RNA sequence: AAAA
């Protein structure tokens, strides 16, 4: 019917008939008629409120799309070059077209126009037709369409497909055009969203990367992102000093990674590190639960965690960095005190010891010994001077100048912004506290079943 | 060269009955191809590509131009069953080995899969995604894939053969006016994703990290709008960092920018009254921290409010942190009620009568006898509270002895408490009692200040 | 290559 008309149109062009105008006179009334009757919309017709169409110099295409989507309000992203075809378009579709002028390659302004129209019509179904117009114009429209259904699920990118295309006439064969709704590539490639999780993980926003991954197991039915979620949850908890949780998640990950099904999960190409880390968490959670400094591995893990936390907060959470480093030094020092028999909270000071400690503290804080009251618990500076006086070897290596600086720092624990007190801690002092804590940490590391490994996270492997 | 002559002759020939496709192939295409073999016309500038990737439709001369212009060593050609035919013509024109991949004429998911693949296998090299030839659905699939993977494969350039004169009747570019053009990535240019992440962090409290995203947003967008945004997140970071001078500096900078002509319509101006208020609070706190004078009720209130809100944020996860913030807020609110009485918690000039009444107060509270109670030199949290109740303090006096009983273990929670002197994540209800007491004292203090949440980002 |  139309196929006969198309064959006779080809014959007509082969007779020297000018193909633009000949097509408009001969074929186009018939094809336009069929579409005004039964718009060919491939995955059945869909109910659209607004359609947005690029317009190029084949307005018949845009006509087909406008009828096919059947929208009420119709926008036409056209170029200065294709503006001249709006009137005929309007007369064909019998629709009032809101025109918008855009460059023929202004991908960017196309895309902004789509974001504008979408926000003008947020809750209603929208057909973004990219049929007519340059590839750049369609790139704008399609980038915006495929990106914005995350936020406007009712927005559908559409095109006028054909099932037969004439390469000499550079037209579809009349009657073989249909309007194909196009799927979003973020349906069957939801897995690619992992890179966002990979990025959220790569900045250390573990809590967020974990929520992202749990979404991934919910979005694309894969359970393998659940293992990533486990790892990220582990790091969030570990950074939070929630070693109980940190371990719960890490153990769950190592159990899953044990299974035959996850033998190939990329996290396995890091298992030696992962295992080490969860063991650290084990060591800490036991030590935290035991509170005895005999568990050198747990003390090491808590000290290394605290010092890691203070290091990464050294510039943008200075008061928090101080908190972390002060607690780390107290830990390492108290472990040193357990080594030499005693425990700082109720050390048994001999009177000779109390006088030795008072003399050291005096000639460290710059007072006469008779000004010195010994507190019942050894606080941080008392512990420092006392371990020094009991011959703790690593602490011996401290010449009285860096010791004086540490004493100055140490009086800022007794009062600070987050302690019962008021002063924001000097970053010089905090770095000195952390340098001494780091030295003790390495001493301790030389002494643990763990050996070395770091809080810093294992690669996702993807 | 004047292939313009040839193009006019080719037009002359078609208008007189000639086949446009064959005639283009014999008159125009040789000459045009000659010129593009000499000097490929790449708009921004030619750029070395490891790999170019071209959708191919029934106009292989387009993908030929695109191949020549991108000059990539390794050339994929996405094609359809219906366009596979032209692969030999393309091979001849480009003199280049091709890596054809067959795809459906509307297989947007597949262009997508293919880009994911080629990019993974060539992750760290410049790759041009040319969407010239083929269907709008084909180019659209390549473009979606490109603009998306560009973030993670930053050497990727989505490119396309533009033309400065398109013969609508020949449905062809006029020969010579074509040019290969790096299309801007709109996702990048607008940094919609960096915004979405920065919004996520900003809402979730990760102010410093949102700030870094905004600062990078400036460079990706060329729009200093996001500089202001960075400043805002900057200030909130410094504020939660408890560095109120840093927060005040940044906030004032921001208010000075939002005062300017350029940023009258900046979306943060939609909440300017808030910002103004908050920056005033910043100054209040900053003045008070500089003076430690508790007549500065607005500074004391702001800093107690800051601590109480940090202890609200952290209680879910930072748990220890949440208690430290709560204790600090309570000790603060308490020192302010105490300063209202002319007394300093730090050294109470308590007369021997007050010492007796405070040992007595703590005895009755804790249930022990008064000489079990040894009064410290600095009034501790519970001691401060019992001394305010001693001294006629109305809000603290309105606390039942059983409430103070249930609270006194919580105010014993200090020390212990992993980040202080022990190993305890103090109980969420332990933190709760402190935080609600502090909330009451905070609201009371808020009344006595003439001043009487981070602000929405506006997107 | 501005309905492949």
Residue numbers in the entry:
A (entry chain B): 3 to 464
B (entry chain A): 2 to 453, 458 to 464
Paper text:
Guided by this structure, we then identified a TtCsm6 variant Y161A, which displays a sustained cA4-activated RNase activity without cleaving cA4. We next co-crystallized TtCsm6Y161A with cA4 and determined the structure at a resolution of 2.9 Å. As expected, we observed a cA4 molecule binding in the CARF domain, which remains uncleaved as evidenced by its unambiguous electron density, indicating that the structure was determined in the pre-cleavage state. One significant variation is that, in this cA4-bound structure, we were able to observe the coordination of both the scissile phosphate and the 2ˊ-OH nucleophile, which are positioned by S60 and T59, respectively, resulting in an O2ˊ-P-O5ˊ angle of 159o. Furthermore, the contact of nonscissile phosphate with Y161 is abrogated due to the alanine substitution. Upon cA4 binding, the primary conformational change occurs in the CARF domain, where a mobile loop along with the two helices situated above the catalytic center switch from an open to a closed conformation, completely enclosing the cA4 molecule within the catalytic center. In the cA4-bound structure, the HTH domains of the two monomers move toward each other with a maximum shift of ~10 Å compared to the apo state. However, in the cA4-bound structure, the hydrogen bonds between N416 and H422 are disrupted, causing them to separate with each other by a maximum distance of 9.4 Å. Moreover, R415 also disassociates from E332 and exposes its guanidine side chain to the surface of catalytic center. This remodeling positions the R-X4-6-H motif into a catalytically competent conformation.
